Design a binder for this molecule. Structure first.
Ligand SMILES: Cc1[nH+]cc(COP(=O)(O)O)c(C[NH2+][C@H]2C[C@@H](C(=O)[O-])CC2C=O)c1[O-]
Ligand SMILES: Cc1[nH+]cc(COP(=O)(O)O)c(C[NH2+][C@H]2C[C@@H](C(=O)[O-])C[C@H]2C=O)c1[O-]
Lengths: 404, 404
């Protein structure tokens, strides 16, 4: 065990795969909104592990839930029942007001599950001829790194080199109701999968009334509306789900990341009986999906969000953050956009700087954030952050931006 | 919170998806080789969560590793480095003697990652024209429930209804070297993915010399040999990897399940530099893949396997188990097969009994096991089980089988 930061990089370089190019910073401790590196330096976290730690790192109540259950039982597999799962299922379903939930582990798996449902329902309920069922996605979407996920990606870095692509995936522009209308003319379309705000694409927010339109068009052409809320859901945008901003009820909602508070890989797929029960016994699952340990963390993690009114906090602090960022000069920061605490800025890439360089200097001033395309820096702190703390971070941003 | 077993079933029936039909038994506690239900009844576990708990449930050293790290840091995402990952990577790679490891969460994800590597290497190193690269699998294979996984399945229950399938997946019979030779005639084949013993299919063991043949044919036609050891690896069959029985070195090995000891979803993809480095930064990953918490559990979990010589235990006890099971009457138990502590029996389905009924009666006599096709019951206890305990379980098996 080499203790120094450079030794952590070079050890991961030798023995680990080069499938990431992370911001050079070796972290050793995390608590609430703060991260510490192995030389003891302290950083505000403005990524929140793409929203996985809405509750802040190692939130005590979520930690205790984990610590309590590990001493009892962690995995039976779903060959048997465990005592915890059904309790979790009763909570999550009643919370979001859907008949049933299907538990999975990672975010991609929730997506894969939704496509399987979309398709199954397409064949069995809609009466589409077998293996002609289609799913529409939006350009800029991101929902994982499986062969299926990357088959619906408009990002060359994701799909280039990764071999024949899954058929039945059509792609239309995001934030475009005429495009959706055009596409849903084909009776073989089963679902449209879309994010209320596109995270990985650079916090792209659609025009007011987009989600209402999507809901209305889906209903009109008998097509399932799948809301991927893995990153925008669970309080970050300032509501339980980002779709709540327009009072829209998707057929299928996907949850992940914050569902655990960073303590365990837990994802969920929420839908009603007419859709969910198209999948009979033996036809879908996952070894760790619904395990006792994950479910306990999830209950705790959801309790934190509700009882600390983190949505309401996120909404109000979001406004402050954006208003301050808009005071930066238009020549340097060309855009500020977001809902709640899922915001971003676009920096003008020039001969004296880019987003990477900025993020390096932010790190040197005690703030951690990562660029997502080369001009776009994302500002997503944990939702347990308070007004003064946020105003310290903003000063760190201003300082760093104005120093170039 | 209803405390009774029937209430656990009916609550999961109402609020949870119907994608499993588990053996009616509601478990609340697990430790070593034992599981306890909510009415306080005690059961030997002869499934080991399909090999996830090789180390027994809640093994103290693995528990402590989890308990220690949760208080420190659990998830930064791979936008940054953490202090733990590279330590894990140095251990796992040196243990199995491969240059690099790519960390993922669930078993399916390791599979998906291997195909992506197989393909990428096919295009970039082998020079296959883009999107003609093929992967061969074996009939009866099982490696997850993604659209890709089920696209290579010969099981109707897995693929029927799940919409157009991934191209470039050819399927040949298992345990058939002439079939493999035939298939690898096509220069566009990139990899052959196969299990040393097929778990989900009903513990199907190939003839001695199959894996040597597979290794020799793969090498001859410049095709990657991908060994899925998610279930057979990590001591269960009586070796570090089941492939070790024939001293064969696959190009890519997949690990999972026992890599954590049931305490966390951790999978790994192990290969050398010429294959691994075909994937550049930004082109593959996973939110929870390589997280500090999972890596700490994994180190601990691998330490238990080595320092408690569980392979050596598994091998010896395996022999006893099989020898005893073969003494059962041929009229009832038509086959016994396995390596180490991954065994199974086939029951003759008749009007007086089947595998399901048997497993119900085993439950009533304090043993837990599930059938995998309707005639096949799997016997896979945790590897920390000792000779007397195993001989108590055997008496439970004999008793139950002879009572019909
Ligand atoms: C809306 C939505 N839908 C599904 C998923 C799949 O989630 P998962 O990783 O658990 O399979 C995600 C995960 N988003 C990630 C993962 C990440 C990495 O480091 O690989 C980069 C990144 C940026 O957004 C998601 O944002
Ligand atoms: C060799 C190998 N390779 C990949 C995977 C997928 O891994 P994972 O589920 O972790 O994603 C598995 C999973 N084995 C399981 C999971 C299960 C269910 O409930 O669906 C049926 C069962 C029987 O063995 C595997 O044995």
């Amino acid at each position: 065990g080499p203790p120094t930061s450079d030794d952590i990089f070079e050890r991961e370089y030798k023995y680990g795969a080069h499938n990431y190019h992370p911001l050079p910073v070796a972290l050793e401790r995390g608590k609430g909104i703060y991260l510490w590196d192995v030389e003891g330096r302290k950083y505000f976290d403005f990524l929140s592990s793409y929203s996985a730690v809405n509750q802040g790192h190692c939130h005590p109540k979520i930690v205790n839930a984990l610590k309590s259950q590990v001493d009892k039982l962690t995995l039976t597999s779903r060959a048997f029942y465990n005592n915890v799962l059904g309790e979790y299922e009763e909570y999550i379903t009643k919370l979001f007001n859907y008949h049933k939930v299907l538990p999975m582990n990672t975010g991609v798996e929730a997506g894969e599950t939704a496509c399987k449902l979309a398709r199954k329902w397409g064949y069995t309920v809609k009466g589409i001829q077998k293996y002609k069922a289609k799913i529409v996605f939006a350009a800029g979407n991101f929902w994982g790194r499986t062969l299926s996920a990357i088959s619906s990606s408009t990002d060359p870095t994701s799909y280039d080199g990764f071999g024949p692509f899954m058929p039945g995936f059509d792609i239309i522009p995001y934030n475009d109701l005429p495009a959706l209308e055009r596409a849903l003319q084909d009776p073989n379309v089963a679902a449209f999968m879309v994010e209320p705000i596109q995270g990985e694409a650079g916090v792209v927010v659609p025009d007011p009334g987009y989600l209402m339109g999507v809901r209305e068009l889906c209903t009109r052409h008998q097509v399932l509306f799948i809301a991927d809320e893995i990153q925008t859901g669970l309080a970050r945008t300032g509501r339980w789900l980002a779709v709540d901003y327009e009072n829209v009820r998707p057929d299928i909602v996907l949850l992940g990341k914050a569902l655990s508070g960073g303590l365990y890989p837990v994802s969920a797929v929420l839908c009603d009986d007419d859709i969910m029960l198209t999948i009979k016994p033996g036809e879908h699952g996952s070894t760790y999906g619904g395990n006792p340990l994950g479910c306990r963390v999830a209950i705790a993690a959801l309790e934190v969000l509700e009882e600390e009114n983190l949505a309401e906090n996120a909404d109000k602090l979001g406004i402050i953050l954006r208003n301050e960022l808009m005071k930066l000069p238009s020549d340097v920061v060309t855009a500020v956009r977001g809902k709640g605490l899922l915001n971003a800025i676009v920096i003008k890439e020039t001969k004296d700087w880019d987003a990477w360089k900025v993020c390096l200097r932010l790190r040197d001033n005690g703030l951690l954030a990562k660029p997502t395309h080369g001009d776009i820096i994302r500002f997503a702190p944990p939702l347990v952050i308070k007004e003064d703390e946020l105003r310290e971070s903003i000063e760190i941003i201003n300082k760093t931006i104005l120093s170039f």
